[PDB]
Symmetry: C3
Subunit: 659 residues, 3 copies
Amino acid sequence: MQMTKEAREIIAHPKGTKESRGVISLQDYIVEEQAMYDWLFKNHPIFTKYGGKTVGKLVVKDRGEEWIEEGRGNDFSKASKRSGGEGFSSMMYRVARNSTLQYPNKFIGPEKCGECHPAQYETWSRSRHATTIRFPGEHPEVNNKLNDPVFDKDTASILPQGITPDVVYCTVGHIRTKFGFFDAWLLRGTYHVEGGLLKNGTGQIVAGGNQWQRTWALNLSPEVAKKIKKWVPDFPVTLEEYGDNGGYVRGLASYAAKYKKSMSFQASTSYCEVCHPWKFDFKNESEFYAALGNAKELQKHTISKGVSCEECHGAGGHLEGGSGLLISNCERCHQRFSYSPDLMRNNPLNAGKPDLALSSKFKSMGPGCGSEGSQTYFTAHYEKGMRCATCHDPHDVTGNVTGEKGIKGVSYNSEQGYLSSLYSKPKLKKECTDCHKEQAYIQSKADTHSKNSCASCHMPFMMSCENFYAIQFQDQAGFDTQRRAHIWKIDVDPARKSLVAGSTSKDPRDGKDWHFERNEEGRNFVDLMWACARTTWADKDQAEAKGCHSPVVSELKETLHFKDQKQVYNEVMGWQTPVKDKFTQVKVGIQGLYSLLEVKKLAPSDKTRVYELIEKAQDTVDLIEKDGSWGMHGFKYTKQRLDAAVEYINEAQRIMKKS
Amino acid sequence: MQMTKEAREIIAHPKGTKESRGVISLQDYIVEEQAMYDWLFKNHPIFTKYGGKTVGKLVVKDRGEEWIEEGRGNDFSKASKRSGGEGFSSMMYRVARNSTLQYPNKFIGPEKCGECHPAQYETWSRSRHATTIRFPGEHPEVNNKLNDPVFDKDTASILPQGITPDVVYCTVGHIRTKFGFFDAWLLRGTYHVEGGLLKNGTGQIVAGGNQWQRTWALNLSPEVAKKIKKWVPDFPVTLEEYGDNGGYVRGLASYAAKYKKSMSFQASTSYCEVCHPWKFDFKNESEFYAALGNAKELQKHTISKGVSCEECHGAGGHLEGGSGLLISNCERCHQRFSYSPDLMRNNPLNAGKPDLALSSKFKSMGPGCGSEGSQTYFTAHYEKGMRCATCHDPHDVTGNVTGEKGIKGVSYNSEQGYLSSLYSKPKLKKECTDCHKEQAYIQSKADTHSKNSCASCHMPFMMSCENFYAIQFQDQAGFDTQRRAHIWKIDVDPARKSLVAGSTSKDPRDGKDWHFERNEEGRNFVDLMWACARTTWADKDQAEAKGCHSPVVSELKETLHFKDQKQVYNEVMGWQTPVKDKFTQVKVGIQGLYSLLEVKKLAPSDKTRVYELIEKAQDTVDLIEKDGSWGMHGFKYTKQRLDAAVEYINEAQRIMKKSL
Amino acid sequence: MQMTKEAREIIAHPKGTKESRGVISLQDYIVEEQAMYDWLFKNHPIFTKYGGKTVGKLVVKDRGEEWIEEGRGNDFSKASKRSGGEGFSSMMYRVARNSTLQYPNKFIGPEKCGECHPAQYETWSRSRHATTIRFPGEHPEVNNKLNDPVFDKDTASILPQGITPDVVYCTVGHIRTKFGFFDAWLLRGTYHVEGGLLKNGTGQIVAGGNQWQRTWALNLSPEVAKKIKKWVPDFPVTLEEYGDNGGYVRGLASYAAKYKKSMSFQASTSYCEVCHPWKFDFKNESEFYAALGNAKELQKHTISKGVSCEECHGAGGHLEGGSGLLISNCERCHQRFSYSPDLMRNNPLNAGKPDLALSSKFKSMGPGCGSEGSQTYFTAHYEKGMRCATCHDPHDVTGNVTGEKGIKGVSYNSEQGYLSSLYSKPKLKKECTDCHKEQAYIQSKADTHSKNSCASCHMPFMMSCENFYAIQFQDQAGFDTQRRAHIWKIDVDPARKSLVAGSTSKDPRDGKDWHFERNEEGRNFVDLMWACARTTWADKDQAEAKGCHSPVVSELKETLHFKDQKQVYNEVMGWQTPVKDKFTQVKVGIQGLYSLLEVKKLAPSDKTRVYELIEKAQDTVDLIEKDGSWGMHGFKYTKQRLDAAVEYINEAQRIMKKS
Ligand code: HEM
Ligand SMILES: [Cu+]
Ligand SMILES: [Cu+]
Ligand SMILES: [Cu+]
């Protein structure tokens, strides 16, 4: 057992700044983790109780790999002029302030910020930022039964087999999408126990079957899976067909682990403390390591859980003795840059500019949760100065969502506010209609999609939280679809996809180097299958609008179930072709007449009329060009205006003739 | 004599973070005040020279009550899941950085920021932020006569009877609204001395008669009071009629005190250092306590006065050795939340969300000064991400206001720029017209209110700075009206009021738990009485527009003096009803015609014409809908466009008729 | 040799705050410099090897003069109530954080910020902020030949006579405009050496001939000069006619010096560290003074060069052990206020308000480079809350600019991206057309200037980077024109000038107290000569649009070469006068028809028609009024459109006739 080679090379020859400059920087964080892994190798029960034997190999994954190697950081580093191409690049995972390995820290806890800022405490406290980290006893949404089935009695409990609350420090997550756990040794829970209990050192440690997944447990029954299989012939139906991604019961999937084959061995320090953090109140590291291995002692000494005030604003915020106030830009946890060699090779003028080949973290073939920032970085919105806080309230990030009263589960409790909810409804400072007036105007007119939100087409749930690759069939715009894309640009095309395999991929399902495609303007885009026909169980708008056009969840008539991108493109063109044809005629007419007002004299009263008509026709052209949807924001009204405008041009042309 | 019970409990069982974490938090600030109060109980003249005897009882009011109990902080705390409902909530009064009890501090003074930032120093220095704290010798606007009448010889001086400059550390405030003072022991001036001078230990300490009020001393003469009384029969005229709120001479009211009945005993450290601060340059606390009681010594060692650069930006700003730069969001001094159990009770959807039952500090029955933030918090503006500095320049907060040459006073001096002025004109980055273009366009059409500013209707002076409850008659939108409401939304209703009494109120004027009402969108709103017919002497726009529709100050004909809200509402309906009616006709016509074009056959040029007409009508409807005032921004223009649009629709119907 | 009197006075009676308060402030910076000047008076080669003898007088200029006296700080101070009118005002030059005289510092260098922020590193690293300070060996754009001619073999090399790379700490600047150098003793390069080499202490120190200038070396050949001479009689053609401003070869001018007459003696600490900084990693001031005089040692210990992350964001940024995160408002280096007594005197409503009499730094008769801030301060834009970061990306400040392949040069290499480029194209978040919609609409119509940017008219290159006063003829809008004015408001007048001499000026070219004029709204403005007819070689838009109307560089026909402002004004009237005529005609008509409508009875159909026509004409009027250019944004569309509105009025009249 040892740390990753990358970590060991840095430990052997470190070039941090803590000792030389008195300022901590990337390499210092890599170095400081050595003692934690030494401790775990001697003290974790996998070794003390199970003799280092597991069903599946242990694969150590420390900061050396996560904070340096992920997102092809080493390839990015080589493509950069920084440090002569010999440097390191932390693409996805890193902290801005001290890690949980430094004691003492200056955290005072959110309740103390709340004494003076009760208003923000209240909104923050009813958000998933506040409860992403929770202890046993803090799950009223499952009546505090972490080991009983949540929904149907043949589906999974939140905790895996053999894992009981007394050896769990915390759960991570929510009913919203999924849960994970950390054991009392603060080791990421990538395993379960068969034929025994971790608590007693009995049975066997088995890789995988460690991650509770709401959609698989609740929505994705074998019956639903058979329905998908009619359309997608290789969709897995039985548990065994979920393979390495699955496990022993539906709802508990293998994550950072392949069922019975391999499992990551990872401290919270290496990864999870970047985005689902906690802080302890210990005065020094001796106190910390003494408690390490007892959940109750660690819980009692926990001064901050989850994404609290001070995770965003800094320890002690602006207070005297604190570490200095920050205003988060969200990129610690919501950015997730991933360098793509394929995007780099699109243009020779990219030489020395590898930032132009950044994409987003992908979980196998889907863009990963927490990648909204790397998505928005290649949008017109980001170019125009817009950031997360432009649109989002940074405190009330969950909104007034509630549980599902029609769900009859063995443990599920629908009455616990947002904790019971399958959805998110973040509080917004800006709606699309605030900035896009012409689009709002046309889309407000009574028509096919006028009831739907702008976000319903423009912000599909493309993102994978669970890395449930066994159900990722991305050309069918499903089925591992749990977070919302922040791309906005919709591409209208019969074939071009948003998501593409890397050129290193040797099998269409191996998931190698997937990335977002870039359009002609160098921007990310949403293809029409995602925009119109995606299948998801995370999207409240979709569920309130008859499942949109998904062959799996649509309640529309079968001819409006969109089964491939070309079909969707055909529907779009049914509206766009007639709009563009009339649009062109009108503009052709407007020039036909403007120019021909030099080659003819008219009775002043006819001249007035011709001017008047083409001026009104020009108003319609401008509105439609500015709208830019070519009828997709409202065919009926767009056609009404274009019909009028061609009448104007014909009336004017009739007049010009009589001369 | 002792500190409040709330402070003593926290001192007895403190749960701050200074010792356990090395970070100062709320409870540490409560604890640190113990020494100051012990000192005051032994060393203040009230005790050393007057035997602790005062006319009216002494009421200690330290941070334990001000920073913990105010705004029903304890009820908010019990309504919250935070700390199992057993925590504390500082609703209004707290600091962000060290208080004036820490020595040494890192303040260098605004003149030092000004060495490198001369431009911002200049604009800041000509603002009331810069001069809210002043020493004797810094009042040219009264020819430095703090003890002679400011205006008429029968009205008040700035300092009350028995209080002389040499025992005053500072004055607080301006001619703008009011003044207060702090004695050389840094105790808040809630008293005067009858038959003697404080400096000689003679006479008697008497509660109240301590706050100079411009509006009472200048504008609210017995003559004006009598005029008001014809409308409002209970309105006080004689000095005796102002009761506990008054005192011994028109212009000096009792504030944080009741004349001869009670007076707050309060160090500057408990309350005033939050919003009207100063900082001293002492190396340690021994030096500070040694200077205490000596105005000249304290003044000499004052390194920052009032809302200086570093009060906003932190002590030493971004400089090496400083405390770290801050950009103020203004909530230290301009927010003032107050929790309203009635707003919780009346909306059951707010259960477990005490933040949605937040209101503003009320001074009796009017929202307090410095509550703009708690007001804006419940507006569309704040919801769209707008904050104070969206609209406001943070430095030039007073603007180019001047005195009134027409005022002849015993001491008043009109030539001192903003210091002489009765008004405020903060420099703005954004005007209403920058974001509300349709409203601006219609409003620019010459009519009844074309010379009104947008803020004249939308931002009435509803706020009470002085807590002059004796003249607060909120249903008549007067008469203690010194600061500008930041609410904007105008409600259109015959009876519904912006301001209402709490359910604890047992008498229409007892002033218990008054608060803002919330509309169907969960927002604050301005009722039509405030928007149209309010009475104030702090609103220059109103003074320059014939006093608007106030029965008391309107110069308009008597038929345009609005005596109550139903009368205003009926005037509004007279404009909105015709507009709304015609708007509805035009909108139905447009849609009806569009629908009929889908089936009824017309010659090409008729179809052309019908389309053309309904598109023109649609332009008009879109404009008027987007404006959303239904004629209140420009009645004749609005109805004219709609009358023209009605003509377009009728011609279009004429064409449809021919076919049949 | 000694420090300036202003410095010595402060040193004698210091009222800083470091000792009393523990906080560094302005006067502390002045005092701290004393050791450096003592050291230079004893150790610089000028004294140790040349015996204090120079061709031209040594003029010491320290922080005492730069940070205190510049911009008429003492007059501003006296005009202010601050400190009784007896204090100091640092108008242009000061730092926010420790100077380069304090050791150790907390800088970790931009490559360490880049480890975690690879994206911002990439865009920042290809900007002139990043390379404004460079060491010998880092000039691929002249093939690293600092002593060979850049362009033609009879024009200048970057380094002057007798100055070799081995005794130069760094160069300042780029091909873009100009270069400068610092010797190994960190003295500002205001001299060269005739008859020997500085490294051997041979030859004589000669004042001036020290600043390499791109425009003089490349563009302003004797032929071009002759051409300008035909329009401007006094224009210098021969090297000798450039006088004190010139030197011994075309391309190397005298700056902070007069050729063979005077040269400033200035440490980097007094001035250049404000805006073109660097930082050393020295652990104390002893290590620093020990390396002084050795270019290689200093270079080896340089941890930050130029305007790096930490110069804007503070040393160590937000990192633990750092000095605390900043977000720069750019005023350290781009503001440059200069108090103008003339502006104060010429408006007695500004009495007691010297801030309102602030102008910008002028380099002789042109506004200085890095005065964008003091310029925008008196604009509508600043008043509305706009700041540098409203329009600009703060990282990607240079943009995708490239060299010129057509240039023949002895050393010039045109293939090093932005390093080879003569232009700047800063990345913007907002374009003029984002906020100014009506102007954008009119300007989009195919017409005379429709291909041109808004910035082309509104932001001419008025600013002097080089103080090349020998070619400054401002009434002719030329010819020392290297940076872009940030004023936007164009004044339309036959004679009023943006740039005027101070009342202390005696000769029209003595360059005394020049300043911007203020218009009737208290704002800076651009006169029509600058807007339309200016001569520059720094403006890419101008170069891509036939040199605009410069008599010197225009490729237009000769009737479109504008020689004076009166001629420009007249061309503007050619357009605005017909537009305002028709405009007024329409307003009169609308008002007339409207007044008649209440006393006139019309058939329902006739009335419909008159309202409608009036209403169309009103829309046109509103658009033209909103545009506010009266044809300057597109004469053809504007005039055509007003003509039609006249027709609407005329048709309305024909219907009103039936009364
Ligand atoms: C889309 C590009 C442009 C934008 C957004 C823009 C914007 C503006 C604005 C906002 C004004 C002020 C109008 C007022 O006072 O109400 C203006 C005036 C002016 N612009 Fe432009 N402009 C553009 C292009 C141009 C061009 C190409 C030229 C010259 C060829 C030009 C020359 C002027 C002049 C001379 C004025 C002064 C008008 C007067 O005061 O009479 N502009 N422009
Ligand atoms: Cu996730
Ligand atoms: Cu007040
Ligand atoms: Cu320059």
